[PDB]
Amino acid sequence: MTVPSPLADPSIVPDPYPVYADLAQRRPVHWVERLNAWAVLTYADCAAGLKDPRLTADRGLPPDNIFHRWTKNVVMYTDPPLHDALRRSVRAGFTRAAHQHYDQVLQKVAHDLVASIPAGATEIDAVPALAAELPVRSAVHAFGVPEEDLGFLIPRVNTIMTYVTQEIILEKLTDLHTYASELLQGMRGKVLPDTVIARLAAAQDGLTETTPEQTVHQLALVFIALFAPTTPGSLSSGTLAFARNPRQVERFLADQACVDNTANEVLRYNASNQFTWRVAAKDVEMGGVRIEAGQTLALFLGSANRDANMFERPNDFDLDRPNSARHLSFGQGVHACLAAQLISLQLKWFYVALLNRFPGIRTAGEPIWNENLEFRSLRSLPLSLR
Ligand code: HEM
Ligand SMILES: [Li+]
């Protein structure tokens, strides 16, 4: 627990993959002091870890604080059986029928955003112009966040997501709860019909295994996830991958199977959430290391996704890869991303619109990355359009 590791250093965020690969070969499970946790780097160990009921997500200041009340009442930080009740209680937003509707909505929203870039424009910064914007348009039109309430919501989520005191974070999380409960009573903006939130709102008279107060907690989680840097990061990193791989732009334009695999290969190529957290409920052994009950683990999804044992030539962005769907960028098992299909639709329709209008995208200078590996996301992506 005293051996140095570079994994929590901002210096590796621009390109963490050679670091992951060097460390995995020698110490696939090892202690990272700045994370206060055991890093887990291989695909096999990350996948086992996500499936392991001995590893809890219940990670939970005065004891009645809102962070504790929130975490103990949302799917992301609870274990079965409560987790499973909480997850069933939001199923109405994410049915097969709902996704057939979101498919159509997201095709149009992505098309219209890309079409708003003048055809004669020669350059853009694809992060603010596109990657930051499409998730907001999707939040409004697919999820049903009222357009008129974005001024309230987005800056508060940005503050909560800061890489600012503990007091301020508790205040903004309190505000999200206030907003969520008032939204459901018609006191805030108008929720568009047939959206995720409209469906959840209509389901509230039918609760059987969760409480109205838990709906409020979970909606606060949804707002944080919606405006987190994860969706922008996926959009911008995939845009960079196409800009650096013109042969894959060609394959995308030539082959519907490549289009169909684009969301998953983009997600595999760069996990936005490069690691997620677990706590050992009981002693476990991983990577030859005895991890004791109570200790924290960081499962490096981003490393797993470039493990050559699962993905041959893992550093190739390859739309013809046959097993891209095995990526761990949405996790796996109990806590697998609630919005996985919504996100993959958003990604698919973005690249359809982008590469048909601007097949000639290329970088116009070096991309600039952020400094937080956990929520890894380009700050700027200067892009020539022609
Ligand atoms: C590219 C965008 C996104 C990525 C890469 C992503 C990634 C993830 C990952 C890795 C997990 C599993 C965490 C774990 O096992 O500890 C997860 C869970 C979750 N995600 Fe996403 N997410 C994205 C967008 C969203 C959005 C927009 C929403 C809005 C609803 C969302 C809602 C959730 C929820 C509620 C969970 C917890 C599910 C449960 O515990 O049962 N995610 N996500
Ligand atoms: Li940043």
Coordinates of C-alpha atoms and ligand atoms in Angstrom, one line a residue:
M1 CA 0.0 0.0 0.0
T2 CA 3.0 2.3 -0.3
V3 CA 4.1 1.4 -3.9
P4 CA 3.7 4.5 -6.2
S5 CA 1.1 4.4 -8.9
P6 CA 0.4 7.1 -11.6
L7 CA -3.3 6.2 -11.9
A8 CA -4.7 9.3 -10.0
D9 CA -2.5 11.7 -11.8
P10 CA -3.9 14.3 -14.2
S11 CA -0.8 13.9 -16.4
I12 CA -2.1 10.6 -17.7
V13 CA -5.6 11.9 -18.8
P14 CA -4.6 12.9 -22.3
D15 CA -3.6 9.3 -23.1
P16 CA -4.0 6.8 -20.2
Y17 CA -4.0 3.7 -22.3
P18 CA -0.2 3.0 -22.4
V19 CA 0.0 3.5 -18.7
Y20 CA -2.9 1.1 -18.1
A21 CA -1.3 -1.5 -20.4
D22 CA 2.2 -1.2 -18.7
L23 CA 0.7 -1.5 -15.2
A24 CA -1.7 -4.3 -16.0
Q25 CA 1.1 -6.6 -17.2
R26 CA 2.9 -6.3 -13.9
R27 CA 0.4 -5.3 -11.3
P28 CA -3.2 -5.7 -12.6
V29 CA -4.5 -5.1 -9.1
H30 CA -2.7 -2.5 -7.0
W31 CA -3.1 0.2 -4.5
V32 CA -3.5 3.9 -5.5
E33 CA -3.0 6.1 -2.6
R34 CA -4.7 9.2 -4.0
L35 CA -7.8 7.1 -4.7
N36 CA -7.7 5.3 -1.4
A37 CA -8.5 2.2 -3.4
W38 CA -7.4 -0.9 -5.1
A39 CA -7.1 -0.3 -8.9
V40 CA -8.4 -3.1 -11.0
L41 CA -7.1 -3.0 -14.6
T42 CA -7.9 -6.1 -16.6
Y43 CA -11.2 -6.9 -18.5
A44 CA -11.6 -10.2 -16.7
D45 CA -11.2 -8.7 -13.3
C46 CA -13.4 -5.7 -14.0
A47 CA -16.1 -7.9 -15.4
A48 CA -15.9 -10.3 -12.4
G49 CA -15.9 -7.3 -10.1
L50 CA -19.0 -5.8 -11.6
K51 CA -20.8 -9.3 -11.2
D52 CA -19.4 -9.9 -7.7
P53 CA -22.1 -9.7 -5.0
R54 CA -19.2 -9.5 -2.5
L55 CA -18.5 -6.0 -3.9
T56 CA -21.2 -3.4 -2.8
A57 CA -22.1 -0.2 -4.4
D58 CA -23.4 1.1 -1.0
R59 CA -20.8 3.8 -0.4
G60 CA -23.3 6.3 1.3
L61 CA -20.9 15.2 8.1
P62 CA -23.9 15.1 10.5
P63 CA -25.7 11.8 10.2
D64 CA -28.9 13.2 8.6
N65 CA -27.3 15.0 5.7
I66 CA -28.8 15.1 2.2
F67 CA -25.9 13.2 0.6
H68 CA -26.5 10.2 2.8
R69 CA -30.3 10.4 2.3
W70 CA -29.8 10.7 -1.4
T71 CA -27.2 7.9 -1.9
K72 CA -29.2 5.4 0.3
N73 CA -32.3 5.9 -1.9
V74 CA -31.1 5.7 -5.5
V75 CA -30.2 2.8 -7.7
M76 CA -26.6 3.9 -8.3
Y77 CA -25.5 3.5 -4.6
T78 CA -27.8 0.8 -3.3
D79 CA -27.7 -3.0 -3.3
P80 CA -30.4 -5.6 -4.0
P81 CA -33.1 -6.0 -2.9
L82 CA -33.7 -2.2 -2.5
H83 CA -31.7 -1.5 -5.7
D84 CA -34.0 -3.7 -7.6
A85 CA -37.2 -2.1 -6.3
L86 CA -35.8 1.3 -7.1
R87 CA -34.9 0.2 -10.6
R88 CA -38.3 -1.4 -11.4
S89 CA -39.9 1.8 -10.2
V90 CA -38.5 3.8 -13.1
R91 CA -39.1 1.2 -15.8
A92 CA -41.9 3.2 -17.4
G93 CA -39.3 5.7 -18.8
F94 CA -37.3 3.0 -20.5
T95 CA -39.6 0.5 -22.1
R96 CA -39.2 -1.0 -25.6
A97 CA -42.0 1.2 -26.8
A98 CA -40.5 4.3 -25.2
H99 CA -37.2 3.6 -27.0
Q100 CA -38.9 3.2 -30.3
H101 CA -40.1 6.8 -29.8
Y102 CA -36.7 8.0 -28.5
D103 CA -35.1 6.5 -31.7
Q104 CA -37.2 8.8 -33.8
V105 CA -36.8 11.8 -31.6
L106 CA -33.0 11.5 -31.4
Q107 CA -32.6 10.9 -35.2
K108 CA -34.2 14.4 -35.7
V109 CA -32.6 16.2 -32.9
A110 CA -29.1 15.0 -34.0
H111 CA -29.9 15.8 -37.6
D112 CA -31.1 19.3 -36.8
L113 CA -28.1 20.1 -34.6
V114 CA -25.6 19.1 -37.3
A115 CA -27.7 20.9 -40.0
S116 CA -27.3 24.1 -38.0
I117 CA -23.6 24.2 -38.8
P118 CA -23.4 26.4 -42.0
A119 CA -22.2 24.1 -44.9
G120 CA -19.6 26.7 -45.8
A121 CA -18.1 26.8 -42.2
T122 CA -14.5 25.6 -42.4
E123 CA -13.8 24.9 -38.8
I124 CA -15.6 24.5 -35.4
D125 CA -14.7 23.6 -31.9
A126 CA -16.7 20.4 -31.7
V127 CA -16.9 20.3 -27.9
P128 CA -19.0 23.4 -27.3
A129 CA -20.6 23.4 -30.8
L130 CA -21.7 19.8 -30.8
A131 CA -20.7 17.5 -27.9
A132 CA -22.0 19.9 -25.2
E133 CA -25.1 20.7 -27.1
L134 CA -26.6 17.4 -28.3
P135 CA -27.0 16.0 -24.7
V136 CA -28.9 19.1 -23.7
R137 CA -31.2 18.8 -26.8
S138 CA -31.7 15.1 -25.9
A139 CA -32.4 16.1 -22.2
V140 CA -35.2 18.3 -23.4
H141 CA -36.7 16.3 -26.2
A142 CA -36.1 12.7 -25.1
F143 CA -35.9 13.0 -21.3
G144 CA -38.4 15.9 -20.9
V145 CA -36.4 18.3 -18.9
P146 CA -38.2 21.6 -19.6
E147 CA -36.2 23.9 -21.8
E148 CA -37.0 26.8 -19.6
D149 CA -35.5 25.2 -16.5
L150 CA -32.0 24.5 -18.0
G151 CA -30.7 27.7 -16.4
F152 CA -31.5 26.3 -13.0
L153 CA -30.2 22.8 -13.6
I154 CA -27.0 22.8 -15.6
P155 CA -24.9 25.1 -13.5
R156 CA -25.9 23.2 -10.4
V157 CA -24.9 19.9 -11.9
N158 CA -21.6 21.4 -13.1
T159 CA -20.9 22.5 -9.5
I160 CA -21.7 19.0 -8.1
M161 CA -19.5 17.5 -10.7
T162 CA -16.4 19.7 -9.8
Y163 CA -13.1 17.8 -10.0
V164 CA -16.3 24.7 -3.9
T165 CA -16.9 23.5 -0.4
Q166 CA -18.8 20.4 0.9
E167 CA -21.5 22.9 2.1
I168 CA -22.0 24.2 -1.5
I169 CA -22.3 20.6 -2.9
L170 CA -24.9 19.8 -0.3
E171 CA -26.8 23.0 -1.2
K172 CA -26.9 22.3 -4.9
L173 CA -28.0 18.6 -4.3
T174 CA -30.7 20.0 -2.0
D175 CA -31.8 22.4 -4.8
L176 CA -32.1 19.4 -7.2
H177 CA -34.5 17.7 -4.8
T178 CA -36.5 20.9 -4.4
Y179 CA -36.7 21.2 -8.2
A180 CA -37.6 17.5 -8.8
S181 CA -40.5 17.5 -6.4
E182 CA -41.9 20.9 -7.7
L183 CA -41.4 19.7 -11.3
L184 CA -43.8 16.8 -10.7
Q185 CA -46.4 19.1 -9.2
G186 CA -46.5 21.4 -12.3
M187 CA -44.7 24.2 -10.4
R188 CA -41.6 24.4 -12.7
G189 CA -41.4 24.1 -16.5
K190 CA -43.6 22.1 -18.8
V191 CA -42.4 18.5 -19.4
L192 CA -42.8 17.5 -23.1
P193 CA -45.2 14.6 -23.6
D194 CA -43.9 11.0 -24.3
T195 CA -40.5 11.8 -22.7
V196 CA -38.7 9.8 -20.0
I197 CA -39.9 12.2 -17.3
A198 CA -43.5 12.3 -18.6
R199 CA -43.6 8.5 -18.4
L200 CA -42.2 8.5 -14.9
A201 CA -44.6 11.2 -13.8
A202 CA -47.6 9.1 -15.0
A203 CA -46.3 6.1 -13.2
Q204 CA -46.3 7.7 -9.7
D205 CA -49.9 6.7 -8.9
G206 CA -48.8 3.1 -9.3
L207 CA -45.9 2.8 -6.8
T208 CA -45.9 -0.5 -5.0
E209 CA -42.3 -1.0 -3.5
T210 CA -40.9 2.5 -3.4
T211 CA -42.0 5.9 -2.0
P212 CA -42.7 9.3 -3.5
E213 CA -39.6 10.6 -1.7
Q214 CA -37.5 8.0 -3.4
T215 CA -38.8 9.2 -6.8
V216 CA -37.5 12.7 -5.9
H217 CA -34.1 11.3 -4.9
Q218 CA -33.9 9.3 -8.2
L219 CA -34.9 12.3 -10.3
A220 CA -32.0 14.2 -8.7
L221 CA -29.7 11.4 -9.8
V222 CA -31.2 11.5 -13.3
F223 CA -30.5 15.3 -13.6
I224 CA -26.9 14.8 -12.5
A225 CA -26.4 12.0 -15.0
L226 CA -28.0 14.0 -17.8
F227 CA -25.8 17.0 -17.5
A228 CA -22.6 15.2 -16.4
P229 CA -19.6 15.3 -18.8
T230 CA -20.1 11.6 -19.7
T231 CA -22.3 12.0 -22.8
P232 CA -20.3 15.0 -24.1
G233 CA -17.1 13.0 -23.6
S234 CA -18.5 10.1 -25.6
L235 CA -19.6 12.4 -28.5
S236 CA -16.3 14.3 -28.6
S237 CA -14.0 11.3 -28.2
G238 CA -15.8 9.4 -30.9
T239 CA -15.6 12.5 -33.2
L240 CA -11.8 12.6 -32.6
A241 CA -11.6 8.9 -33.4
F242 CA -13.3 9.5 -36.8
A243 CA -11.2 12.5 -37.5
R244 CA -8.0 10.4 -36.9
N245 CA -9.3 7.4 -38.8
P246 CA -10.6 8.4 -42.3
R247 CA -10.7 4.7 -43.2
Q248 CA -13.4 4.2 -40.6
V249 CA -15.4 7.2 -41.9
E250 CA -15.3 5.3 -45.2
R251 CA -16.5 2.1 -43.6
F252 CA -19.3 3.9 -41.8
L253 CA -20.5 5.4 -45.1
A254 CA -20.2 2.0 -46.9
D255 CA -21.8 -0.4 -44.5
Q256 CA -24.8 -0.4 -42.3
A257 CA -23.2 -2.9 -40.0
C258 CA -20.5 -0.4 -39.3
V259 CA -23.1 2.3 -38.5
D260 CA -24.9 -0.2 -36.2
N261 CA -21.6 -0.9 -34.4
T262 CA -20.5 2.8 -34.1
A263 CA -22.0 3.6 -30.7
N264 CA -20.4 0.5 -29.1
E265 CA -17.0 0.9 -30.8
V266 CA -16.9 4.6 -29.8
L267 CA -17.9 3.7 -26.2
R268 CA -15.3 0.9 -26.1
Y269 CA -12.6 3.2 -27.5
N270 CA -12.9 5.8 -24.8
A271 CA -15.0 5.1 -21.6
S272 CA -16.2 8.5 -20.3
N273 CA -16.3 7.0 -16.8
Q274 CA -12.9 5.5 -16.9
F275 CA -13.4 3.9 -13.5
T276 CA -16.2 3.2 -11.1
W277 CA -16.2 2.4 -7.4
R278 CA -17.0 -0.6 -5.2
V279 CA -16.4 -1.5 -1.5
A280 CA -15.6 -5.0 -0.4
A281 CA -18.4 -6.3 1.7
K282 CA -16.3 -9.4 2.5
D283 CA -12.7 -10.2 1.9
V284 CA -11.9 -11.0 -1.8
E285 CA -8.9 -12.0 -3.8
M286 CA -8.2 -10.3 -7.1
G287 CA -5.0 -10.1 -9.1
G288 CA -3.2 -12.1 -6.4
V289 CA -4.1 -9.4 -3.9
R290 CA -6.1 -10.0 -0.7
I291 CA -8.5 -7.1 -0.5
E292 CA -10.1 -6.8 3.0
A293 CA -13.7 -6.1 3.8
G294 CA -14.3 -2.4 4.0
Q295 CA -11.6 -1.4 1.5
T296 CA -12.5 0.4 -1.7
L297 CA -11.9 -0.7 -5.3
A298 CA -11.7 1.3 -8.5
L299 CA -12.7 -0.8 -11.5
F300 CA -11.0 0.7 -14.5
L301 CA -13.6 0.3 -17.2
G302 CA -11.5 2.3 -19.5
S303 CA -8.5 -0.1 -19.2
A304 CA -10.8 -3.1 -19.5
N305 CA -12.0 -1.8 -22.8
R306 CA -8.5 -1.8 -24.3
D307 CA -7.5 -5.2 -22.9
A308 CA -6.0 -7.2 -25.8
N309 CA -7.1 -10.4 -24.3
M310 CA -10.7 -9.4 -25.0
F311 CA -10.2 -7.0 -27.9
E312 CA -7.4 -7.9 -30.4
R313 CA -5.5 -4.8 -31.5
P314 CA -7.4 -2.8 -28.8
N315 CA -5.9 0.5 -29.8
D316 CA -7.5 0.3 -33.2
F317 CA -10.7 2.1 -33.7
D318 CA -12.5 -0.5 -35.8
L319 CA -16.1 -0.4 -36.8
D320 CA -15.8 -3.9 -38.2
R321 CA -14.7 -5.3 -34.7
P322 CA -17.1 -8.2 -34.0
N323 CA -17.4 -7.9 -30.2
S324 CA -17.5 -4.1 -29.5
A325 CA -20.7 -4.7 -27.5
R326 CA -18.6 -6.4 -24.8
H327 CA -17.3 -3.0 -23.7
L328 CA -17.8 -2.0 -20.0
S329 CA -18.4 1.7 -20.5
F330 CA -22.0 1.3 -19.2
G331 CA -20.9 -1.2 -16.6
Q332 CA -22.5 -4.7 -16.5
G333 CA -25.0 -6.5 -14.4
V334 CA -27.1 -5.0 -11.6
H335 CA -26.0 -1.4 -12.1
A336 CA -25.6 -1.3 -15.9
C337 CA -26.4 2.2 -17.2
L338 CA -30.1 2.9 -17.1
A339 CA -29.7 5.1 -20.2
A340 CA -27.5 2.7 -22.2
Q341 CA -29.9 2.4 -25.2
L342 CA -30.9 6.1 -25.1
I343 CA -27.2 7.0 -25.2
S344 CA -26.4 4.6 -28.0
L345 CA -29.2 6.0 -30.1
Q346 CA -27.9 9.5 -29.5
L347 CA -24.4 8.5 -30.5
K348 CA -25.6 6.6 -33.6
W349 CA -27.7 9.4 -34.9
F350 CA -25.1 12.0 -34.2
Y351 CA -22.5 10.2 -36.3
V352 CA -25.0 9.5 -39.1
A353 CA -25.7 13.2 -39.4
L354 CA -22.1 14.4 -38.9
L355 CA -20.4 12.0 -41.3
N356 CA -23.0 12.4 -44.0
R357 CA -22.7 16.3 -43.9
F358 CA -19.0 16.6 -43.1
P359 CA -17.2 13.4 -44.2
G360 CA -14.0 15.3 -44.4
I361 CA -13.6 16.2 -40.6
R362 CA -10.0 16.3 -39.4
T363 CA -8.3 17.9 -36.4
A364 CA -7.3 21.6 -36.7
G365 CA -4.8 21.6 -33.9
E366 CA -4.1 19.3 -30.9
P367 CA -7.2 18.3 -28.8
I368 CA -7.2 19.5 -25.2
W369 CA -8.3 17.1 -22.5
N370 CA -9.6 17.8 -19.0
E371 CA -7.7 16.7 -15.9
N372 CA -10.2 14.3 -14.3
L373 CA -9.7 10.7 -15.3
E374 CA -12.9 9.5 -13.6
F375 CA -15.1 11.7 -15.9
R376 CA -12.7 12.0 -18.8
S377 CA -13.9 14.5 -21.5
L378 CA -12.3 16.7 -24.1
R379 CA -12.3 20.4 -23.3
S380 CA -11.7 21.5 -26.9
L381 CA -11.7 19.7 -30.2
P382 CA -10.7 22.1 -33.0
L383 CA -12.0 20.5 -36.2
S384 CA -11.7 21.4 -39.9
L385 CA -14.9 20.5 -41.6
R386 CA -13.6 20.3 -45.2
Ligands
HEM1 C1 -22.2 8.3 -22.5 C2 -23.0 8.5 -21.4 C3 -23.0 7.6 -20.1 C4 -22.1 6.7 -19.7 C5 -20.7 6.3 -20.3 C6 -22.6 6.2 -18.5 C7 -22.0 5.2 -17.7 C8 -22.5 4.5 -16.6 C9 -21.9 3.5 -15.9 C10 -20.4 3.0 -16.1 C11 -22.7 3.0 -15.0 C12 -22.5 1.9 -14.0 C13 -21.9 2.4 -12.7 C14 -21.5 1.3 -11.7 O1 -21.7 0.1 -12.0 O2 -20.9 1.7 -10.7 C15 -24.0 3.8 -15.1 C16 -25.1 3.6 -14.3 C17 -26.2 4.5 -14.4 N1 -26.4 5.4 -15.4 FE1 -25.2 6.0 -16.9 N2 -23.9 6.7 -18.2 C18 -24.1 7.6 -19.2 C19 -25.2 8.4 -19.3 C20 -26.3 8.4 -18.4 C21 -27.5 9.2 -18.5 C22 -27.7 10.3 -19.5 C23 -28.4 8.8 -17.6 C24 -29.7 9.4 -17.3 C25 -30.7 8.7 -16.9 C26 -27.7 7.7 -16.8 C27 -28.2 7.1 -15.7 C28 -27.6 6.1 -15.0 C29 -28.2 5.5 -13.9 C30 -29.5 5.9 -13.2 C31 -27.3 4.4 -13.4 C32 -27.4 3.5 -12.2 C33 -28.2 2.3 -12.6 C34 -28.3 1.3 -11.5 O3 -27.6 1.5 -10.5 O4 -29.2 0.3 -11.6 N3 -26.5 7.5 -17.4 N4 -23.8 4.7 -16.2
LI2 LI -12.7 20.6 -18.1

